[PDB]
Each structure stands twice: as C-alpha cells, then as structure tokens.
Amino acid sequence: EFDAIKIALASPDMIRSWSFGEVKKPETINYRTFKPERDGLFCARIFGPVKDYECLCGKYKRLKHRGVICEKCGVEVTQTKVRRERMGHIELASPTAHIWFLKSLPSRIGLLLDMPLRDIERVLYFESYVVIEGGMTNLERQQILTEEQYLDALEEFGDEFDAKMGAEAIQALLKSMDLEQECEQLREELNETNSETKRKKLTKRIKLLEAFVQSGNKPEWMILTVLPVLPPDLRPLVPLDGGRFATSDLNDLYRRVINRNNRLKRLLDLAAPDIIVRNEKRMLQEAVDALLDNGRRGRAITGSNKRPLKSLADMIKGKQGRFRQNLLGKRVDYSGRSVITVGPYLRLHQCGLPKKMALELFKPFIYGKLELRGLATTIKAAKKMVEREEAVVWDILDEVIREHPVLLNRAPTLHRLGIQAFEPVLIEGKAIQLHPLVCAAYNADFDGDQMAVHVPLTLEAQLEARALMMSTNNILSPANGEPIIVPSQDVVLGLYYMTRDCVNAKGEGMVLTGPKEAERLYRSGLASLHARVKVRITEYEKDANGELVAKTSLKDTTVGRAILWMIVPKGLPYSIVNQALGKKAISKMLNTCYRILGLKPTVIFADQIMYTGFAYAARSGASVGIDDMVIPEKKHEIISEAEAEVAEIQEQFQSGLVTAGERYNKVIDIWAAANDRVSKAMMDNLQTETVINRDGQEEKQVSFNSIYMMADSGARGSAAQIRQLAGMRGLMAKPDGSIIETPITANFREGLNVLQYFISTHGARKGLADTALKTANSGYLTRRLVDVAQDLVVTEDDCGTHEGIMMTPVIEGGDVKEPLRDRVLGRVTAEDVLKPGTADILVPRNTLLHEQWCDLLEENSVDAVKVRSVVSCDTDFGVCAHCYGRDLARGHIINKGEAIGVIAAQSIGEPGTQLTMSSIQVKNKGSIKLSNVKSVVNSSGKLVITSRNTELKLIDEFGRTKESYKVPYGAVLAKGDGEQVAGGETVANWDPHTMPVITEVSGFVRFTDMIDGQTITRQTDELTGLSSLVVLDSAERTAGGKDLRPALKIVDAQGNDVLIPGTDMPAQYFLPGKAIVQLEDGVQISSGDTLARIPQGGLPRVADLFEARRPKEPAILAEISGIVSFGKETKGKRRLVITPDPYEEMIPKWRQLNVFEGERVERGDVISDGPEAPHDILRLRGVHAVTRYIVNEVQDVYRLQGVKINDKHIEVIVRQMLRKATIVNAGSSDFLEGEQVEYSRVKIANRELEANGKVGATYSRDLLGITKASLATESFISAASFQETTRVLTEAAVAGKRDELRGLKENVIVGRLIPAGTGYAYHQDRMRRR
Amino acid sequence: ARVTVQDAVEKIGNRFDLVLVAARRARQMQVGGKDPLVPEENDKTTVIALREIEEGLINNQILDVRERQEQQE
Amino acid sequence: DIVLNPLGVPSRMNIGQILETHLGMAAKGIGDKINAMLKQQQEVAKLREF
Amino acid sequence: GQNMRVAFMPWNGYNFEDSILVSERVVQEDRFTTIHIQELACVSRDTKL
Amino acid sequence: EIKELLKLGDLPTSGQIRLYDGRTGEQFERPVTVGYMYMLKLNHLVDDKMHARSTGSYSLVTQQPLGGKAQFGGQRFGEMEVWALEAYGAAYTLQEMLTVKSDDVNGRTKMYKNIVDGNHQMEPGMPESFNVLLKEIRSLGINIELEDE
DNA sequence: GGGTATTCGCCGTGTACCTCTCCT
RNA sequence: CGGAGAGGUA
DNA sequence: CATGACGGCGAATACCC
C-alpha cells in the first residue's frame, strides 16, 4: 500500500486541503445537553456525525441515506469514525510563528536569516522592529529598531522604506529572500573568507539553504497563517460521574487560540489603537506556541491544577508519547498474567496454565470448536456454554491447547529469553506453574514474581513459538553460548549428596552387578547412598563413524553414583558422574551431553537430572540449624590477640612513635589479618570431619555439615556468607566509603549488638539504594544500544572480505585474563592458520572454528589467529554470516535474517545491573623476548632501554607467550634478551621518580647554550651539601633565561662529538625544566646511568566507552610520523610542529611529555600519558585498533564482575558506531567535500566509479556515540521514536526527508513484518519485485 | 519435531525458512483440506507439518511441485 | 504444617528465622507439657511447679 | 499471623526458589482464611432522556 | 537459654528431630530442623492478581486494548518485549502483537472471525495508533504522509 | 576581526503490574 | 475512561 | 510561584589578542 513515509513543511494551502471545515467558536459542547456546539471544536458538520449514519438534527438515520449531506444541520450522513480522520483549520487573524522552527536549536528561522534568535524573539513577541527592503537609506534589511527609535527614524525618514514588527515582519523577510542567489553569495563568500570559524558558520547556513532548495518547502511556510486542528475523536472529553468532564488539556489550548484569534479579528475590523492590537497579536502568538509546544519558551501555561498543560508536542514525545507508548509497544489481546509457582513435575517444554486463564484466553477457539461439532448453533449459545463452564467445554479446551504453545514473559525483559514458549498443561488453582530450569533464564523466583502469558493466534506465530521460542530450543545463552538450564539450589544439593562418598557407609565393599542392584540395595536399606562399592558399569563411546561402542568394566564408585548413572544417556563416559557432583560438575556434564548427543537428549537428560535432584534432596533430609554454624573455638583468642595488637599500636600512637594515619592503616591491616585467621580456622574446622574407618581407626573426610554441603556443592552460599554466619562479619565502611576502624567481631549466630548492627545498616542501605538507582542507568544504556544496533541484520552468506581482526589471548601481565580458545571459538578465520612448520596449513581460509578446531589449535600451540569480524565486513546494509560466525544460542553458523544487533544489545545490557558503578618480576619459567629494543654498551653490561614504547614477552618454551609487561624509558633489565628464568626474580628495575636522558656513548657532558643562574641554579641541601644543579622551568625561570633553551652535548677526551651512528645531526639533549643535574661539569658519563630527575570502572565506564566520550586529560598522539620540532614552547601552552610538510600542534604546557625535542616518533605514538581517546585511536591507528580498544576496555569491566559476553556483540556495537564517514576529497563523486554521510553510500559510489574507471572519493571514518549514531541514522522515524523527537522531526520537515521502511523499528511502528527472521524473506520478495 | 526442531532445521537449513515452509504446509492441511503424509498421531497441523519436514516428505521444492501439479491438472 | 527450603537461609543470612524456629519449638514443648498436665487433671501444685 | 509447625528440608522441588509447601491441615483448620469486605455502589442519576 | 528451654520440654537441644516421609514411611537420612515459625499471609493473594483476557473494550484515541484487571484490560507488550521478539526473529508473532491483538480494528475482527472459523491466519492492516500519530504531526503544521505502492 | 575558554539552555535519566483519592 | 497525586509488588 | 540533580553537548558569549 506504501513503500515510504514523506515528511515536509505544511503549506497553508496543504493545511486547507487537509481540512474539512473551519472552527470559529471556542466552545466544545453544550454540557446541559451532550450535543456539540455549531462551529466548535467538536462541530459535526465539519468533523462528522457523532452517531453512525445519524445527522445531528436526526432526519436521516439509515444506511440507505448514506452519502446525502443533510441540508438542515449540514452534517453528511456517513460513518462516525470520520470524526477521528477529518481535520479542521483555523484561519489566523495574523500570521504566527511556529515554535518548533524558532525555539528548537538551531533556530531554523535564525540560521536561515542570520539575525540572532534574541532579535527574532523580541520582534515576534513585540519588543522591537525590523526593516524590510529599506532601499536607498542607511538602514539595512535586518536591522533592529527599538520602540523608542522607531518613531525617531519615522520622523527622520519614514516613508521610502518599510519597517514592521511581529510575525508579519518575519514572514515578509522569509518570503522576500531569494534562495538560489543567496546560496550563490554564501558559497562564494565561503571561498573569500579568512576565518575557519566563519567558514563553519557559513557552511551551516549553506546546508540549511540547500535543504530548502532541494525540497518543495518554502521558508514563509514556517509562519503559520492557517492552524490545523486535530480531529475531535482524537481529543475526547472523558465523562466524570456523567455530569461533569475532566480537563482534556488539549481542547483548552485550542480554546485559548480560538479566543485570541476572535479577539484579534474583532479588533482588526475595529481599527483599534495599535498598542492593544499588538498586545493581542502577541498573546495570540503565545497561545499558538503553547498549543504546539507548551513550555518550550517561557512560563509553562498552567491548567486548573499547577500541573502544566499537555501540548501537541507532548503527545508524540517522551516515554508517554505516541512512539514509545503506542507504536514501539502496546497492550495486546489474548493475554493474561498471574503469580508463578514452581512446577517440579513439568517437562522443560511444558508450563502449568490455570484452566480458568486458559478458558478465557482460548475463548474464540472454544467457540469455533463448539460450532464445529454442533453443540452451539449460534455465537450466543457458545458464549453461554463457556460462561456456564460445562464439561464438554472443558473437553474442548483440552483438545484446543494440546499442542498450541503459549508465551511466558517476566518483566523486565532483559534478553530474548525473557519471553519463552511452552506447551500449556491445564492445572487447578490460579497460579502459573513454571519449570525450575528456565527460572535462571527469566531471573525468576517464587517470592511474589508474576508472569504474563500470550497466545500465538496464527499458524505462523504458533510455529515461531515452537521452533524459535520454545525453551527446549533455547537452552544456550546467546550472549556467550553457555547453557542456561544448569540445575541450581536443591537439585544441585541432591546430586551432590547422592554422589558424595562416606568413609564407613553401610554396604561398603560390596560388588554390584550394575546400577539396578545399587538402586535395589539403597531402596531396601541394605546399602548406604555414599557407600564405596564396585559396580559393573557398561558405558558407550562414539566411534569414528558415530556408532556407540559399548565397553563394560568394574568401576570403583559409590551406590549413589551408580544410581545416577541410569539417567545418563548412552555416549557419555562414566567418569562424568564418578565424583561428588557440584554445580560446576553438573553444568559440565550437561555441556558434555550437548556436545556429544545433541539437543533432544540434552533436554531429556536435564529434566531427569532435575527430577533426581529434587527426589534425593528430599530423601537426604538436608536441613539448617543453629548448630550447623560451627564457630571456631580459636576465634575468641584470635580476637583477643588482635585487640592486644591494636592496643599496642594505640599506645605507640599515644607515645608519638606513629602518626594518626599510619596508626589507622596498621589497625586496619591487623583487623584484616585477624579476619583472615578467623575465616581460615572456621573453614578448616567446618570442611572436615572425623569418622571411624572399616577398622577402629580415625579418618578425616569431607564434612557432611548441611551449610558446608550447600556451599561446597554450589547450591547456595559462599565463603563470605559462611564467614558472616559463623566467623565474623568483618570490617565495615562509613557512608562516605571510609573503612571503620573497629570491625564487627560478632557473627550472625552470636548476634550483633546495637552498634555493630547500626554500622552494618550503612552498607546494607548503600547496596540497596545502589541497586535501585543503577537499574535505571542499565535500562537507559540497554535502550540506547538497542537503537544503535536495531537495524543490523545478517543479510549475506559471505561478502568475500579478506580483512579481519587479529585475535590473541588477553594477557595483562602475570595472568591469563582470557584464553585464545574462547576468543576464537565459533569464529571464522580471515586467513590461513599455519602449523609450527610454517608451511603446513592447520586451518584453511574459511573454517568455522568449532570445538575440534580449537582443540587442534591449542594442541599445536597457536599464538594468534586472524578471524573475520562484523566491523570489517564488506556487506552493505548488514553483515554476512561468515564475518559474524557461529550463532551462540543455536550453536551453528548464524542464519541469514537474524537480528544480531538486537541480540548484541540485549547481551551487553542484561548484566548491566550486575555491574557496580616500580620493578617487574616474572613469576614462571620461560624465555625472555624484547621487541622494539636496542643493544648498547653499558657500565655494568646490562642493557638499558631507549625506545618510547617497549614491551616484554615471556614465551614458555613451546612458543606461546604467557606474560607481557610494559618497560618505561630508562629501565635497565637485570638480565638479557633470550634468557631462561626460573621464576620469581626482578627482571627490570627503574626509578619512578627519575626520568633520565641517558646517552649511549661515554664522555664529558658539555653545557652548550647553558647559562649559569638563568636556566640552571645551584642548591646545597643541608643533609648532603652537594652543589646540585636544577634547570629552572621554561616559564618559572627569569626573563633572561626564557630566551635560551637548555642543551647538553656529548664530548670526550679527544675533544670532538661522538653521536648516534647513522644520523647526520649531532647528539643534543634538552632538559626543559624540572631536571636535576646531580653531577658536575666535564664528568665522564658511562652508559647506564641517570642525568636528570623528573618526577613521575563499572556501568558508567561501559556507557562512556559506548558513547565515545573524550577523557578529561586525553593522551596526546602524533598526527603524522616524523621528527618533533617544538617551535613554540611554554607561552601558556607549548606548540609542537612535527616534521615528516611539517604541521603545528597546540599542547598545554602543564602536561608531561614523554617525547624529547630530538625524538622521531611514529604516527599514533604516545606523546603524553593519559586515557586514550577512541576518536584519536580511530583517526591514527585505524578501525581495527579502536575496535580492539573498545572491546578490551568493555571486557575488562565485564570480567571484573565475572560476566561472560562474547566479543562479537561489542564488535556489532562498534560497527554501528562506525557508520559515518566525512568526505576528505570530493573527486568525481557528488558528495560535497567535508560533509558527513553514510559509509555504505561512499562504498557504493566508489565501487560504481571504479567500475566506470573514474577516481573515487576519499573519506575519513567517523566514530560516533551510540546516542549520536542512533540520532544520525538515515531514517527520521527511528530517530524521532528514540529521542529528541521535536528536533528530529524539525530537521526532517525542513529537509523534506523521506523514510524508506528498511529497519526493524520503522516496520514495527507501521505494523509490518520486520526485515529479520521469518519476515526477512517477505521483505526480500518485496524488494525484488521493484 | 514437537520438543525440538533440530532435524527439521537441518533438513531445511534455515530455521526461519523452516517456520515458513511448516506454516505453508499447516495451512494446506488445516484450510486447504490436504491430508497428512505421516500418521496423524493426535497432532496439530503445525506439528504434523514439522514431522513431515523432518522426514524429508515436505519442503519448499516439494510444495512448489505439488502446487504446480495441482493447478495444471 | 509447612516445609520451608533450608537453602534460602544461608545466602540470605537471616538466621533469626532459625533461632525463632528453635525457640518456637521450645515454646510449644512447654505448652505440650502443660496441655498434658491439663488432660491428666493433675494437681494445681504440679502445674504451679512446672 | 499464625504459629506454624515448620520443617526445614527440600521436598521434591515444591520449595524451590523460596516456594512454600503447605499441609492441607492448615487449609482445613482455616489458619490463614481471611475475611474481605468489598463495597459496591449503584448510583441512579438524572439522564437527559 | 533456648537449649535450656528445649531441655525443660524434653526436646532435643539441637532443634532437629527425625522426620519420616509420609509418602513412603522411609526415615529421612539426616535430622531435620523442626519447630514453630510465626507466618503471615500477605495482601498479595493470587485471587486479586490472576487475570486473563481474549477480547474486550478498547481505548478511545488509540484502538488498543484497555489496561488493568479492573477494566478487564490486556497485558502491555512493551518495548523490551518487542526487542525479544525481534531477537528471536518471530516476525509473525510480533506483527500479530502489533496489529491483530491491538489497534488494527479490521485486522482483529477478521482474526476473531477466522479463529471461530478454524482458520489460524491473519490479514494485518495499519494500526490506528500510527494514524493518530500522523494526524497529530499534521496538527503540528507538518505534512507527513504515506507514499505510493 | 578572529580563535578560543567560559557560559547557558536543552536533552536525557528501567520494565511490567496492583491499590486508593481527586480532577469544569 | 483520560490525567494528576500517593502507596505497593517483582 | 520553587528555591534538594546532574552530566553531556552544542550554540552563544566573552576575552584575549
């Protein structure tokens, strides 16, 4: 029916064409009757009959009469629904300015006219005059005349020119400006201009003028001569107790506009004095812009209560606006909700639906089935049978829902798995029964949680529920690929208890024919569940061709493990159960089952595991009592010793031996050590128990204490909670965050005193309020991510790109943060992966790395793998399946049509609430490797480092690096390159308080261009008395010293200068202030010594990274490589002009500089320290560098909290951040040089130009924040529905934008099939038919 | 078919295409009066279509061939 | 009368519900004796003593 | 509230994730049966007709 | 003191006793904490919370279902729910959420008739809320319209 | 007259659900 | 049945 | 009248040449 949405300015003729009549009266309805007044806001001849086919006077009341316009009342007989489609118009007595095109920054009228917004406000609101077409007088065409000077100019010369005020003057100025010639004037003035600020300001106007020129919009249309009126059925009057009506908050503004328009009309024909007429014009203007955007300028016009009136702009913007409240989401039919209870008997694909809810939800299906078998002749008969709830009605309801899935949802829906499909089972009662294993996916529990249920009506929806959303098809997390249905709590406890072993349990030493005999013995009480026995076990292993070869052997196991073996499907080894099965062990068992056997056996196995866990947790009788919280008997003496220690420290402080701060630090350390000792004693006493062996001998075994079993199994609790229960609560923090000196020595079993409890309330309140105020920030970040990634869909199988990102294991130095396996699992290689033979190809160019491929890579000691990424994908309008890689939830390569952007946004957003707002030493055996390092002579023979950026790698024999360290300048290694290290020795040392200028060759240092007393000064510290020299800072020095810069040359006994071989410049070093010359003149400086001394994370961090926010003190980098030339130094801010054509740069002087005046740094080198701005990373080191930076920085935050998110989601977000490009050279393309456009547009244009053989345009990739990227998208519909609806719609209307319904949000709003998933092919069929 | 669609997915190759083909077949059986190619073990048209797909009896090409034969005879 | 899950006690660290439970048992025990003394129609002195 | 004889043990999943298992004797003794009083208003007004 | 009171009542001092499974009579393997806890019934009864709607009354401006159990309203399928549907690729389920279950007046009538007829097929149309948005933007003096087919 | 540090006004700030009173 | 205010549940 | 929010960002302002 339509392919696009067109938006532009509305001409008065267009507004009249929309309208069906003019509203002239300010009254809505006569409230004595219920009839609407003639020519009012609810008038019937204009908008339509109130009743269906009933004209207002009531003559014509029939369908036959339809189409006849009644000549008595004037109302056309027709559907009453036309009252919500037919618009009115108000003929304004005077022109009025539209507030959106005036106040919404940038002012479109102001920019289009170059008169400041202040002057437009004063003139429109009747505080000044503007001269229009002055002519031969000195007055210009945009000069402001004050009320006091207007008549003065009139008397001086008041006839040849024209001057006006109000909206009429602004409309005249807008209508008397020629667009094209003024564009030409501005475009030429853009050339003959010397100010780069001026060229930006002119190009802004040029871009606005081109908008008005390329579209059919006329500037004068921004002044409203005709005001459209919304249809009355869209602004109804809600009856309150029948008699009285509430304030509509929209009809009131219309009434004020009509009142002021009528007053202005009745004064216009009256020819009243100009002062009151101008005042009425001004008041009509504020009435109009209050109707459009109430409160945008000035005081918010107020209703009966102090609450501001809700304007037309408020209708379409905000959380309660049309877009977010009625288009991007809406209330639905065939839906219900109820409290959830646990269904432990349910299968994974089943849910427990109350039969009353099912009867209501499936009601039309029941009616259809009643008609089918003849039990109900009519609709009313079926309705009565359903209301009476007859037995046959219940049988029909059972028939209908047998395989009709329903959707269960729990708010907040943080990820797609927050809505899942289940087969309903009719249950009594009123609560929905939920399968336990899906609770983790829902973040659901049974302490009051409620869930919504929805009925997929159509066959397509039912099959989507079954194949896409059913819980049995969604057992893997899309964020990281890990299973979601791992047993928790009592199931884990049951499996752990039944798989535990007891030293002297009943039935020990028995030899059993198999699991069946073990179950028989346990159920008959002849053998304990933990008895160590020998059992004949037949296990199955897949062969090369996939058949299950059976091997039978005698296993040393327990009775419970043998019993649990019966539910293990064939193909899994017996070792997976021959252990005490905790939470991680059960999860690993489910992982093994999924890897070996597939999805359906995994679901069956998970259900069987949950049944067994419930049953044996019940049989165990696991409880919790006060005695289970065993407090160590050494706790009291540990506390006494800590108190004595802190008392000794306090006595030392009272004797002045220690100060207050170090006293506090020492006491805190002592109490922390005491807490550690108490925790260790408690855990040691709690984790082990004594038991009589087979013989009368004591033996130690893992304790069967209930709390310890729950914690060790992983069902519930942890070390911190156990030590809070039975150890001590520990050190607490004050509200400002400082640690309280005295910790809580009591535990929860002993009970706290008033003081300790009040102290703990500080942290409790802090945590609860932190959660309450962080959930909103997490939701906002999730929404921004969803918008920035909403339209990204897998649209291709393979784009054929060769580029990719280089994946290495994440190592911060001294630990393996993240292995290579998890960073390449499910990825597609971008190039060939070789064997250590360097010739044999381990992995070809287009392999999808599954588990076996990763096993091969780690077995052949692979260091780095180049993999394809969505950031480097060549696909336009989406990405290819190969660059994205494996679908984490499904476990195979991503299918075409998947909305990976929304998946990535949810994957990142969901754990948001879990987020909380000297010398190097190698610690392991391995060879040493240095890169970007040079070998020089040394005084002691151990190499110094000279390069600005130096890093050290420890390669552990086989060829894989394990640790990586950063070596600052002037750091002398304690060993050499390529030397094996036992582990635990200081590899390199450096003084952090001293920055040397070390010279490679020895000789006497000569003070060249050095003046004593001006640029260098002598002190003698009393402790030493040495004549130490200090270089005065380039600004802190004297006036005479400011002219001369410090310089130290290298001379030797021979007299000449020995310099760095290979160069043409003599070796000269400069020490620009804050430098300590400790040695005297003419002293042999051996290499390897110092010459001068120079001193020296949570959810908001993730949001800042995704918004591409600039750091407060960004690290300065080199725009172009070359030798640095500091032409300007100090002078408020040192200006460094590098030289490869040299380019100047402006740098603050108070910033530290790693570079020296004679250093040849490369492009992207760290000139100064500080957090790196991602924009600079993209500009200088490329797209891959900024992608890696964002990925690493986000994953640091998420790993700190133990959250596992695949990097590909962050890469999707980065790719959405990198959609814009600025044209550097126009070439033969149509793009204006220096403008920002879509990178895909530039790719297509360059591709077609190169196909024609012409030269393509050059571009610079732009990194935009997710909010900025979302607001800069081509579709104005999506941007308007996101944020800043007024500004976005104003931009679209002025530019005459056209929106092709290409994205997910756009098609959701217009209620079409989204171009993703099952609808994707439909859109393809829509595209290929044009 | 019922609990999981892995066999049907691997027959079709694309899960969304599987949903579309199953919907077409289920509409044929529910509204078009067509008969199941598998025994009707008290299943719904959607599940019957999925069972037919996972056994290779029904796919997009087979449905197109049968449609052309039906309209040309 | 009601079966509560022990596993909601350790991580919640609301140990009072356990102690109250113990104390509740003790309380009921006292009543269980007094009720018995009331059912056997024991001497008022015996109830006084207990 | 009411004094309930409580046992701390898992019971076949019916107390999973803070769920509560309640004996039918509690229902029979009306231990937690509660009285709710609802006020319905019928207003005869003066219509135009 | 609690253990002393337990002794006075001839009860175990640990507060744990031997329990038997009513279903089978089998003794539970470990002692179970059994006592008396004072329990409250909160004013969050499932009677007041359970609610379901197939069809019902609709709003005036938007033709979407009303809100609230008291008004027999439908559940709100909000933005994050739509995001979940998009992430599943369930385009038809999302479309029926947007149109035949909400403000598509003609679509919902046809859907109800088809369900009664046993034809589980939808013929979605333009939601009325989009038309309301278009009229509202037009009332702001902005010409917004749909293009040709 | 022109470049740049400071200022001012606007934009945004979680979902779903439940109860009550009061409102030209 | 729209809005406002207040409180509450997850 | 309300005077308990604040961070980010772009247009406008002022200050310093």
Ligand SMILES: Nc1nc2c(ncn2[C@@H]2O[C@H](COP(=O)(O)OP(=O)(O)O)[C@@H](OP(=O)(O)OP(=O)(O)O)[C@H]2O)c(=O)[nH]1
């Ligand atoms: N989640 C879960 N499912 C179980 C379990 N045990 C059996 N099932 C599966 O449930 C499905 C329904 O069982 P049926 O026995 O066919 O029941 P029916 O009479 O209602 O048709 C069967 O799969 P099917 O219909 O043959 O499915 P498919 O193989 O076509 O996917 C069966 O394999 C369990 O413990 N957990």
Ligand SMILES: [Mg+2]
């Ligand atoms: Mg909860």
Ligand SMILES: [Mg+2]
């Ligand atoms: Mg079956």
Ligand code: NA
């Ligand atoms: Na099967």
Ligand SMILES: [Zn+2]
């Ligand atoms: Zn008439």
Ligand SMILES: [Zn+2]
């Ligand atoms: Zn690609």
